Amino acid sequence: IDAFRLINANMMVLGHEPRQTTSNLGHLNKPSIQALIHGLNRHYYSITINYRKNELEQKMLLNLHKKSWMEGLTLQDYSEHCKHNESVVKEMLELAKNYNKAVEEEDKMTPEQLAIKNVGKQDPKRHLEEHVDVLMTSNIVQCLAAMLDTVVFK
């Protein structure tokens, strides 16, 4: 979203956008190549727009959009839950075997240049601990929610 404002054609000998006592004009947008081709800055000029945020609007928008009462204590029953802890182990194993394959390999002729011209961004620690972190956090949330309801409900 952007708004604009027309400048007159009489100011041809004076530079447009008569800025005087401001230094925020370098902020909030700079005029891109797709903007300065049609009318900027010789016809119209750009303008800055801020957002009138306050109380009595902002917290009540969050508490009715991103908020759930009954959902924060459910259990996502273990037919598909422990099933999800099985398809991820296999692809992590193959990545571990692939991680095994590179670590035992160990090219030791010009190592620092061979390492920097041959990156993969998926072998060393990209696909190794990403899913491992995800499976760790999920069962912790699931078991802790399972333990709490056993403490509460009798």
Place this chain on the structure above:
Amino acid sequence: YAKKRGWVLGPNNYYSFASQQQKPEDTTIPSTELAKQVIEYARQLEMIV
């Protein structure tokens, strides 16, 4: 042993009391320490960068 402890002679037969345990465990009762162990994991997982 008859005056100090039991082992009281009756009809040619002593009597020893049972000194075993009879504790009716349920063991889902120490569920607080388990949730304590789950939380202190994710405490130690996070909180230091």
